[PDB]
């Protein structure tokens, strides 16, 4: 693998790490200050929201200050969030730490798919996406896994050890990188609703479990965060080797909308069992499968979104990118404050919008086969 | 003839 490349996808990787380390640390943060959810949830939120809102800004600077200087800003921004963040006292300068994270992590991401894009030749575009998605989310999977893990013999000391990832990530980069209108008019906009729509929900739902199994057997079951840790890593190994080995064997048997309403129908029914999970090893199996169906739509949605683009392969890869953010801003917000309304109100939230993405996607089925059949 | 501009939320190609 390319040494810049290589680079390039550790910058994201970290990125989604300092995104993911928050998660198992929310009930120790519960605890000691003393809040409620929706503050929890917000964390994250407001960590999306900054990210979303500074991704085009950011992709501007990029495009006209330079692409190698705004990735080291971003880097070095990035660094001194977690360091700040290491060394919060109150609720203020953890909101502010997750916001300038937040920004860091926006003004990172379209810096580093500019490189990508403009390093590797034209006939790598849908590859170069793939392995975008699979990164991308190999960290937001691994990011809690890893600091619950490590958050076990000090308070703090994951957020100290993303700060030095940071540095040097900033480090390698330095001397590593080097780099020596009317596109939206006819756009149809009535025909990638479906899609935009599928991948709201599967990041919506993606967050909202994140925060929401965190928070529930934490209240529950006492989950330390040590527990949590392990179980949210062994169900992102266990959906990502299940969907290595599966995916192609699923998609020549069936099409899209059928997979992925059977899939949603699976979550909804790990979801109903993991409602009455009231043991440690119960829970912590049930959980080690919910995963998987995330796992397996988000692939399927990214094929689609491949197969409705055609030629505009980036217009799709943007929307992608920005739902998926938008999702991910929307889901713990709500996640955290109705959990605060009620300790498995986010379950019966999960279920509702997995029901209307099922729903949604039925419909969309039943008109292909009605002007198939027309 | 080749270079990446930025448009919103998306990298765009030039002709």
Redesign the interface.
């Known amino acids: 693998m390319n040494k810049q490349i290589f680079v390039l996808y550790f910058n994201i990787f970290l990125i989604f790490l300092g995104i993911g380390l928050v998660i198992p640390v929310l009930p120790v943060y519960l605890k000691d200050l003393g809040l409620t959810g929706s503050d929890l949830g917000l964390l994250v939120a407001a960590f999306a929201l900054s990210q979303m809102i500074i ?2 800004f950011g ?2 600077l ?2 006209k200050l330079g692409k190698k200087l705004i990735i080291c800003i971003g880097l070095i921004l990035f660094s001194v969030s977690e360091f700040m963040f290491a060394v919060g006292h109150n609720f203020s300068v953890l909101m502010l730490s997750r916001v300038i994270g937040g920004m860091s992590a926006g003004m990172v991401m ?1 810096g580093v ?2 490189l990508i ?2 390093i590797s030749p ?1 006939h790598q575009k849908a590859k170069n996406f793939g392995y975008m998605s699979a990164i991308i989310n190999s960290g937001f999977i691994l990011g809690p896994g890893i600091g619950g893990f490590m958050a076990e013999v000090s308070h703090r000391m994951p957020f100290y050890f993303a700060g030095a990832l940071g540095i040097l990530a900033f480090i390698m980069s330095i001397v590593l990188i080097h780099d020596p ?1 009317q ?2 008019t006819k756009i149809n906009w009535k025909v990638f609703i479906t899609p935009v729509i599928l991948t709201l929900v599967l990041s919506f739902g993606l967050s909202a479990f994140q925060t929401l199994y965190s928070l529930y057997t934490a209240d529950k079951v006492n989950y330390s965060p040590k527990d949590i840790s392990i179980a949210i890593t062994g169900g992102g190994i266990f959906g990502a080797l299940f969907q290595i080995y599966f995916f192609d064997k699923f998609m020549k048997y069936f099409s899209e909308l059928t997979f992925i309403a059977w899939s949603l129908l699976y979550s909804v029914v790990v979801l109903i069992l993991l409602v009455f999970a009231n043991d440690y090893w119960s829970i912590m199996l049930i959980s080690f499968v919910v995963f998987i169906g995330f796992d397996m739509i988000r692939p399927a949605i990214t094929n689609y979104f491949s197969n409705i683009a055609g030629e505009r392969q ?2 799709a ?3 992608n ?2 739902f998926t953010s938008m999702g991910n801003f929307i889901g713990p917000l709500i996640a955290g404050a109705l959990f605060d309304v009620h300790i498995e109100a986010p379950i019966y939230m999960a279920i509702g919008v997995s029901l209307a993405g099922v729903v949604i996607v039925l419909i969309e089925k039943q008109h292909r086969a009605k002007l198939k059949e027309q | 003839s ?12 030039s002709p």
């Open positions: 991704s085009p992709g501007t990029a495009d379209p798919t500019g894009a403009d034209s209108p596109l939206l980036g217009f890869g943007g929307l990118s920005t | 080749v270079e990446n501009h930025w448009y919103y939320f998306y990298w765009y190609m």
